Symmetry: D2
Subunit: 483 residues, 4 copies
């Protein structure tokens, strides 16, 4: 299989391809053509021009309707999309069918809907001559949106950015992860078949540094760069767009805590932390790699979680009650296994996991690791502080409400946090004191697409979601009429 | 006069001092103690700590009441602030009495009011178990706000940032321009006398590079850097804070155009462009340095603007009928004059000005220049494309509406634009097509502080004003409760 | 037996039937079963019970999807709705295809979308004990919405109420005009086939006083009454529901002015006033029956309008080039001719029309009248102050801006006004001074469904449209949590 | 003491006067002049004219400043307002000093602030000709606001209506309860002294039927009637303004429940129900006259409440530790006692109270009753369904959560509800299911002035507070410009 770039309405190859690997079994699944600096410039110029074409002339309602057709296009090829994400990543067919693909569709539907309903402001004012003035605001396309997306939730995170971008009338140059190029390529076909004017959506394959990612980033023709990924990659990008003073939107992961209070529903919290630690094999930026549990229930909690964790099925995406697939890649497994060892060096008790499963088949050539639970490390340990991005969590006891708040907040990251308690006063009091963008109480990763989404400190900059996306992906202009 | 730093509730000197010069006559007004890296550190640390003190326990209404007291205090020392601003900058006293100090009061009052009125959002959602969930959002203090302000509208631009910062419950470390430190130092006194808690507001004096400005910018204890200034400085600051992924808010350079259509009120437009080109001696980021005038009225408009410009009184701040003061400094005058000769070299006709007035008194040791009008340059001339930030404009004819829209927009800047026309459709049709953040029709620099303010391209990123400031100077947190 | 009621998911007949007449030729179209008190009761109880059924259990997303299905259902039977509308009202077939039916569908689509986008508010407050409290608001179904609709834009106005009613989770009992029950009956079928649960949407036919309308009005089981129609009927309805303190929403009569300034595009204004006076044979609450023209263009405006008026083709709905159909009924024709005679007795000059066309075919049995223009009446003439609701306007000269504002405003009505001018300041300066709910400048009846729609004085109470409808059709509840 | 009307800038007497009685001891406090129909007409006409005077030329900022001046003037006479409120009604001095007078002040300041911050909307749209259109809304004064207020919270409720009315630039004709005329008369003094232009604020005294109140409602010159009070009185008013189609805003009766769940903080719940039943001697529309307590804690709850209720000090407004003053009047006491008798007749157990205290001093000539608790009545007893408006509650056990929801909602009223529970889920799950406008969890009558305030069913129509008042007291107008 070969995955081409999509530039100015044409699928094109490059002067260099690269392997896309299935991490279930290490087998090559396709050659991906790597866009070069020339092709990137070509994509940007084409997106700039397309702003002055038919796309630019579309009414908000026709634009929305076309976006709903992009979404219809995905629905009609649903299983081809499921297959595509599964292949690239190893994610369980069930996850892909219920989480990834439906959310990608909902992204386009939600922001199309918003594009139609959203409105702006009127401000009246008095003036010395007694005639007054009117200020009104409008939202306009920001211009060319640069999109650089990660491998963990490929289509979901790709469309999270492309959808509001197009809904706001922008054009897009989008660079998916080298590891997960398939679903995006399919989207490009959907765009094309749906009659999205050429130059409106441009797909470019490649890597970061000295490759398509960097080139997009250094290109003066774009108006914004929105990115989800590694915090130091965010910092790099920010420096790159600085001379052009481009608008930036970053969601940059973290080291999230779950907190379980003594008055929690223990069984729900055990199940809740299982999901928050090991979903997508712990390759979500929202996952809890840190857990704090009240001393009075620490041992019981750890016990039940170990039990539930060892019940998880690690195998083929289509395997029966499968719960976990592999890591994205071998490189990523090597980093994760590297932390596995560091955890021991650091004094950790390994409650469960700590290595890789054994298959004695093709999967042994994959990139699987085991769900892991550590105990007994210091709050200052590297394993408790640095983001691992694997199916791992360290559990630690706490005694006081203010103590644990202080411990959750003592981090250079602050994306999300999950809190377990049945007490009303407690839930609201504690929630407002956690220094993150996103709190969940008695649940995790529940997403209403209208809400502001993002992080504090190293975990990001700006917010996306609902009107926050409508604002970020638009020029806000103020028009003042003297009367 | 001696201008001290204000750090953790105390006025402090530093090891080194620099001179504050009166641009009217080149005389020394005061010595200004330069904060060093260690003092910058103390200010940041005090500000972090102040967030955990009494300031952090104030209700929103009590916080607002204290902010109104700050504003009362400025009011009570109104003429001192006027004299301070005038001393530093040479601005006409009547401008300081009607624009500068009044706006600085209004900034505090408006954001104190928004602090009390502003609310957040509630989103209900359905879930699988049929019980649903609530998402609600809150605004919290972002933390410590780094403010770095320019010399052109010292107290106005300073308080424009400090007012919302405080209103949103942050603490502040603020560095006013080395050219214009007096009114900020006075403001510190008002802060102290109003009983603002120690560490909440901190004033550090100095320069940019290798000085208080850069130290502030590099300090990891800050949560945000808000800046109005040269766009190249903005880029530098963006790079400096990138490793911390600090929130940023930039209002930067302009090369703003005024457009005068055939159906304009010609006298009103002449008076209008007079003000937009030469207000504050052209030292406003909003000034018009490019002027496009319909062919059929070009010659008359140019003749009218020449006469009106030659009528401008350039002189002392309290001189009868004075319209224009000097430039901020000799250094800035060197730059302006350099453009003045470059314009000749690029082939400009000098309709008026082009040099420095001769007073034959102490003002000759000052930093005055003449209001200056050019004609005859191409749209590619450096003098038509680069920000001068002096009392200057180039005037060029046009024939067609779409033609002029494209010429205005053909720029790496995009801050503001003023349009002159008596035609209803024209005002609205043209304004929405200008690629800037701010348009005025039949007026200029009319400000409603609730409006979103800011630029596109090199002219900035982000918006401030009204709820845009309430969002930028706050952590926006989403709290999701499973029911 | 032709047009049945639709109660609790079944079409049902009644004890008495009445005739539906085609106003093109006076011929009987259908027999309509008049709901009696018992049946009105049955409808309300069933709507009451439906709230406690699966309709009550839908998530906002599923409820929206269902509403979109109702729209799809109307779309699938587009031509049948056209024929139904045309039959009852005599409206030109092209108007039905481009205005009436498309707007009915748009009504459902818009409010379905808003149901999904709309959110509510979060207010934080401090409390004596220093722990604070939260207030959040929610929208819930108000309950059973009683809908009483008029005959002039039958399906458009019917669905303008039903769409938001259903979108906010209410159930409905709706009574269409005795003159135009067909398209509403067809909607009931669409609702049945779409699977809308029984009790959710109920259709009852009949008259006002001593009939289905009155009884709906007097039933204590409804939660609100929303009504479009005559003013005196609004008053009657307001009194009827008073003992129950039911929520009310009224758009009533108007005696709307168009104002034409000397700087208007004269050709566009003539065409504009031709449409605002004669569209739907002048049977729209937004029609202009008063017209004020600046003296310098009066004679020419009048001559222009007369010519264009006499071009209008009055005839069959499917007649080649037809512009105007008949009036709704013979009884309405008699009212309109009563004013046509009064205008003469009051001294009017009849510029054109003033009687009934003679067709020498079945149309002479229908209810046609001529498009009429009067001149020469005083501002206090009855024909100039009372709503006629036919295809007529009086044209009067004016001289001064403040004069014409006062004359427009001197009315017990205040629904809408149209202003023609090319001057920017004038447009905004004058529009804000007109005492109505709706102003159009250089156009007429341009409708954005997000906008607040309603009148002042006798022309109504409350606003509908956008969030105004989402508010009126919902219980707004504040919930305050002590922390 | 003499209490005059204030009409068109002048205090005036009337042909007839009536007595204002102190309910503590039954003594004459003052003579009140009853406005006749001629004088009401004079007030409304002056109010209409005032809209065209200087009041109408004030900028929003200036109008706001003047309203803050009104508030200052009350603050400067703080204790005279305390004395006036206490004299009229017998309320405890501490309640007047902490709730009543401070709220009146906060009313004016809140709405003054909102006047300055509030803005409106901008809606862009496409058109067939491709040029587009824009819609913008504005808020303007509605006109003359009729205000009719009750005696239970005289200045709080009076200024709750007058503040937003003025803040929205309206003029006012206001009629306080004949039982509590004093504070409103002092406010007329403050208005005069503050320079409020003549006709802007008019104070008329008297009764309802055949007196000033009725005449107000019948006057065609008013634009709206806002009213708080008895439900049947709301109905009578709604009918009276029906012919004019005036805007109406009603907060009316309630028979509010408190619900104590088994997981409640039992002592906090007992204190909270004590306050919600007996504050202001049970004379708040928001008081809980029905109480439901889970079976498992019912006996302990009732014992506890008995004890705390018998601790209450009933007596003089400035008496040491006084909890309750008298009822407003002997007539009102007659009503409440007849309900005391009915409760016994209906089978109630009198847990405490049930009569009148014996003072053996001048308070025996006052209108006091005992705080009263009943038990053992059915949900259909008159004393459980009808509003008594005195210091009483009936307590009933429940078993099931859905059961108690149904029981609370089984009412023709629906003003407020208070729920006691420490459980997170329960607070949010149950609160959204209560059919009222206002829910409190673990508190009572905690008021954020920005929130929507009102009732459902017989308990009112519409909402006030925050933007809801800003909309009700304004013409909302949509202005549509074709471009
Ligand atoms: N927070 C998240 O959701 C998230 C997602 C993916 C990866 N990560 C973190 O990052 C690591 C893996 O990510 P990665 O190394 O594959 O890439 P990366 O996370 O740093 O970045 C993701 C995307 O950015 C692009 N990119 C990388 N470097 C760039 C550069 N210098 N300029 C422009 N674009 C660039 C890549 O092509 C890729 O598509 C993990 O260890 C994990 O901790 C976090
Ligand atoms: N606001 C508008 O757009 C509009 C629409 C139609 C008619 N009108 C005016 O009304 C005049 C008369 O026409 P109409 O009699 O059909 O209008 P109408 O307002 O009296 O009746 C309209 C609707 O209300 C119902 N109704 C009438 N009386 C009622 C009552 N007492 N209680 C409850 N429901 C009642 C009717 O059956 C119908 O459904 C027209 O001449 C015109 O001036 C205004
Ligand atoms: C730049 O020269 C001026 C900036 C002005 C503002 O930011 C303002 O608030 O008016
Ligand atoms: C009255 O005759 C017209 C009312 C029109 C509407 O309500 C509409 O939504 O277009
Ligand atoms: Na791969
Ligand atoms: Na200086
Ligand atoms: Na008919
Ligand atoms: Na009294």
């Amino acid at each position: 299989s070969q995955l081409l770039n999509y530039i100015d309405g044409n699928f094109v190859t490059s002067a260099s391809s690269f392997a896309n690997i299935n991490p279930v079994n290490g087998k090559l699944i396709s050659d991906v053509f790597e866009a070069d600096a020339k092709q990137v410039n070509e994509a940007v110029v084409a997106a700039q021009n397309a702003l002055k074409g038919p796309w630019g002339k579309l009414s908000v309602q026709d634009r929305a309707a076309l976006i709903h057709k992009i979404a219809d296009g995905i629905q009609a090829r649903f299983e081809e999309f499921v297959a595509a994400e599964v292949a690239d990543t190893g994610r369980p067919v069930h996850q892909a069918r219920t989480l990834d693909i439906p959310r990608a569709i909902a992204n386009f539907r939600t922001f199309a809907d918003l594009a139609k309903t959203s409105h702006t402001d009127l401000f009246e004012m008095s003036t010395s001559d007694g005639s007054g003035a009117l200020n009104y605001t409008v939202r306009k396309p920001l211009g060319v949106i640069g999109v650089i997306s990660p491998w963990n939730l490929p289509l979901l995170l790709f469309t999270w950015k492309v959808a509001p971008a197009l809904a706001c009338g922008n054009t897009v140059v989008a660079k998916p992860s080298e590891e997960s190029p398939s679903s995006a390529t399919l989207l490009a076909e959907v765009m094309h078949d749906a009659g999205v004017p050429p130059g409106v959506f441009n797909l470019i394959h490649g890597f970061g540094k000295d490759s398509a990612g960097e080139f997009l980033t250094q290109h003066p023709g774009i108006s914004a760069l929105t990115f989800t990924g590694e915090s130091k990659t965010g910092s790099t990008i920010m420096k790159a767009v600085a001379d052009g003073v481009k608008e930036v939107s970053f969601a940059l992961g973290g080291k999230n805590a779950a907190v379980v209070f003594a008055d929690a529903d223990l069984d729900a919290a055990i199940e809740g932390v299982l999901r928050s630690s090991f979903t997508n094999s712990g390759q979500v930026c929202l996952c809890s790699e840190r857990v704090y549990v009240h001393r009075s229930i620490f041992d019981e909690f750890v016990s039940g979680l170990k039990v539930e964790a060892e019940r998880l099925v690690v195998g083929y995406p289509d395997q029966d009650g499968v719960n976990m697939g592999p890591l994205i890649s071998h490189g990523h497994r090597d980093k994760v296994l590297s932390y596995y060892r560091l955890a021991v060096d650091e004094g950790a008790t390994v409650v469960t996991g700590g290595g890789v499963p054994k298959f004695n088949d093709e999967r042994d050539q994959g990139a699987y690791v085991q769900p892991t639970i550590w105990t007994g490390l210091s709050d200052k340990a590297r394993c408790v502080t640095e983001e691992i991005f694997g199916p791992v969590c360290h559990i630690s006891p706490f005694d006081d409400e203010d103590e644990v708040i202080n411990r959750v907040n003592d981090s250079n990251y602050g994306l999300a946090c999950a809190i377990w308690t049945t007490n009303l006063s407690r839930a609201h009091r504690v929630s407002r004191q956690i220094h993150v963008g996103l709190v969940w109480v008695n649940t995790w990763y529940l997403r209403d697409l209208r809400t502001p989404f993002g992080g504090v400190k190293l975990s990001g900059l700006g917010r996306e979601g609902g009107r926050f996306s409508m604002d970020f992906y638009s020029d806000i202009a103020n028009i003042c009429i003297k009367i």
